[model samples]
Target chain A: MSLINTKIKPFKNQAFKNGEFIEITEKDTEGRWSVFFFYPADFTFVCPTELGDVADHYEELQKLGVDVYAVSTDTHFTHKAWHSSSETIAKIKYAMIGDPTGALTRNFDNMREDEGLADRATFVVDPQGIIQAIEVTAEGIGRDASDLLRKIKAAQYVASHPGEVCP
Target chain B: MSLINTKIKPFKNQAFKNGEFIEITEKDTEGRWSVFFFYPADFTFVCPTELGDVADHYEELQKLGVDVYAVSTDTHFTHKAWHSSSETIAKIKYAMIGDPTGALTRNFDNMREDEGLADRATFVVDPQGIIQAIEVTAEGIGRDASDLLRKIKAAQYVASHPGEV
Candidate 1:
């Protein structure tokens, strides 16, 4: 069965935007769009380049009423460090989540058990928390956020236009 | 500083093959070409189609002196079942490793902890266990095995004629 088109699992817990970590599961995003991006580890090759590419378009993503989150196996602390040290990551204003315990990672079903890291996976969630689109890729090939932006546009168009074929 | 152009870490455990499990590691692949294909979960969408596509080209891969391994976080037991049930998976004659422990996944740096699965990563290892090529993609984007074949050919050609470049 396709995992796509399935309703997103509830946001069990979140680190939130504040520097201090807190839980935000009860808050539902039923009327908003969410883009959840999963990458392997921080401080490694290929990942920052891709994250920067996504960060480069944060403003545009926000204008579309979409919230973006870039996730990795590293802890939130590590995320902050990477964000501070890397100029590319510095551009990101969205949530940089850390999944050290692999809870969120397992929830999305992209964990590589033997390696203890998540695969590169992206999910687009509708306002009601249903996963509208999902993409999983291998490790060596880097992703283009431009392509992701295009996909997001198409997804949003589909949601708003319903029966109309979106170009 | 790059993980690329460096010696690859070796695997200490066994992986699934044929109807039974087998023990093969980086050392086992010494002196021969190896292709490690890191894919998503077992019994999922698009993966089967991609695996099937690669299976269709196994014979040609062998002719190029390359041994291929299809890896995922799913166990070898799952791989065996998927191979038996899915005609495309059934056609695969190479090693279909189960990386439930994820050691191999981390070695390749394709693990997405938040997603708990390996990315769609592909690597070409030379005879000495050095990675010559690597490709990582995001979720939902499927890859073509024919391009992998071409890459293997190019890597092999480059290896045999190092100074030609």
Candidate 2:
């Protein structure tokens, strides 16, 4: 039903960092846990709060050895602008990946072709780049970063102990 | 990204309820919210706790006009057997749908073809049958029913308030 246990596909994209634009690829996420958080658009109603939720938990996720990437169909320039404009967006230290062409979003099967945007989706990838968990909610239903952390902890536990799985 | 906003396809299956075997179809879900909780198999670890978590919240879900269905590739007979054997499984007052042919599991795109089992996935369907939320996890990670309840409440809120979208 979902992309569980699937490896992320390779793609090159530009992202907006703290104050600069940077490039991100599947290559950069090879040996560490990664979370690809996809949302519909920038400067929208719920996207900011959702992104900010993750931003608040970014430090804990980092301590757990994970990288977070916030993605949207908006351009890198737009991401930079939003980061500078909105107090919520500015809190994000993670890469704000811009998938204007939708290639990267489509690779995760997260594209809304008709709306020309991505859905509110979160994919937790293991160190080996395989998707371990997925949570996608419709508009207006914000996700819980704490729940994401719980899943990631279970995933990490399973990764560290081969024969034993988390419950 | 997912099956959100899409109506569920039609399907018919047998289920073990309370203590009786019953038949369920897409038609029975009209005008009522439904939750199709798909798990890998019966008589296994983790699945029972997940199902029981929902079972514990079954009354509240029913109060919200939502019906819960715990589905697997096992037969209805197997479901009854498990319900009789396991206390956790026994707590589930909801229908335990069986899809030995894999039709219902595949309908939700949750079937593990090689293993003849379904993935650990959950789909929340609104009154009109459109899916409102999706939560899928790899094995070993258990889902929380409270989180499911949170999402369902949001969905119900949005459905009741049209322009809120």
Candidate 3:
């Protein structure tokens, strides 16, 4: 079945940011918009570029009252290493989550067992912990963050103006 | 950091088949051709149909000297239940691996952490465990198993005729 309008699953995990390990969960997103961006793996082609785009727009996302988190199956340590090594990743200031145990992956429903990686999927959740939008992509096709930004705006618009749909 | 022609990392878990869990290390693939097919999720739309297509083509895949394994994040128990409840899945005779831990997902590099599911990616591995060919799809776009069959044939042919390259 489709997962449209499903309540956001609670996520409690660790993230690697600015060379430090930080704790994160659904609670951090309680009073704001959340963008959970999932990618296959770190240190691979296409992903860093896509992540860089998101980071480039970080300030704008934050200004919109949204919290963004970029997640992968790699550990938080790996995220830190990638950020340190790659100039593109180095620009990212949002939460970088590691889902080595696959619980986060399973919760998002984008785990690829044969590969031990996540697919390129993105989710938008509201302050009430309800998922508002979702986008899943195939491996070769990289996602566009501007489109995500538009979707976030529409979702937020609809949330604040209940009983109305984005036009 | 591209994955072009890199030696694939090995996983430590087992897969489920015929009501039993079986280990599937890189060594197990030595001297044999292997096909790993990944889908989004179990009990969801489109995936069952795609899996059914693979199951229907299993005999053909086996005859071509290829062993097949279908993987998702769902547990073995869920796989078994889907196999029993869905007529199309009932035709599957190969391993239906449950990747609850995401180890296998990370190994193939197709896990989507936000959704916790895999992209529609398929890989063909040769006897030496080197990935021969791979295809990854976008969401809402289903794959054609017949195309997979053709790719496998071409890959095997290339493997046997390496001097031509």
Candidate 4:
């Protein structure tokens, strides 16, 4: 379950993207750096604020050749509802993955077990589908976009530099 | 669950519809006749053929105030993929409900039990969300859209013209 430098498991799931629904599998993340942003559910407090924060900097993450997949226990239909109803999540351009079956949540060892919800976790994966960085936060702590962006940049730097860690 | 004349179970899942992904809940079928057509899977044999058969009569079903939902155990992503990849499914205008969790499949009592896949079953529901007609077939037996349409029309007529049944 230790994620550091570990390969992500194979998965096939759906996500809401760009006014359309799309499939995202392990293969889609190959040859490209990605962020698997796991959240609890949609239409909840704190979650949208966090998703909005990530949305604010999604373009920058994309510029760095990183695709962000925001995952939740809710279905993609719920994702579409939240995207249409809430102005906060409405700005999100990243993929909002539906993990109703929780196969993905368990794959990352990120399940709450009791609640059957995903922990507030984030995984940064390199082009080869290897986990380079992981962050898990407590509920209500509220993750920061800039800090996450920094962490991803450092992970990218370390991956490319090899001998050099983030200074 | 015993389905004839029984209330349809509640379900909340995603489906590929009209080039967009949409939410399909028990509430969506309220106040309208619906057909829950359960198929095997996506990107497989016979499914597209079956789905395409439904596609040919979708407009007529809609004209009769009946909405068709084709369900499978595949994820909605696979539904979208098959819709884009195959010409038969490409003509489908109905919502392709994804049941990766087996909620809807099992709710209808159409699952294979051992294989965990839905049997080729169909349930006709009236505006009140109550099951009226049901049918289950073997894998090799393909269903006819014309027959399904006839059954739905009968169900609708019986519902409206009560005391005639």
Best by DockQ: 1
Error of 1 at A20 (Å): 36
Tens-digit lDDT string for candidate 4 (B120-162): 9988999898899898999889888899899998887787788
Off by over 4 Å in 1: A1-167
Task: Give the winner by DockQ: 1 or 3.
Answer: 1
Q: By TM-score, is 1 or 2 better?
A: 1
The candidates, ranked best first by DockQ, are: 1, 4, 3, 2
Report how closely model 1 matches the true complex, as a DockQ value.
0.07
Ranking 1 against 2 by DockQ, winner? 1
Residue A34's lDDT in candidate 2: 95
TM values, all candidates? 0.51, 0.50, 0.53, 0.54
lDDT of 1 at A44: 58
**Preferred candidate (TM-score higher): 3 or 4:** 4
- Calculate model 2's interface RMSD in Å: 20.8
Residues A35-72, model 4: lDDT tens digits: 99998755443446778899889889889999999998
Error of 3 at B115 (Å): 20
Model 2, B1-32: lDDT tens per residue? 56778999998888989998899999989999
> Which 10-residue window in model 2 chain A sums to the lowest lDDT?
A41-50
Global local distance difference test of model 2: 0.83
Between candidates 3 and 4, the one scoring higher on lDDT is 4
Q: Which stretches of candidate 2 lie over 4 Å from their true place?
A: B1-165
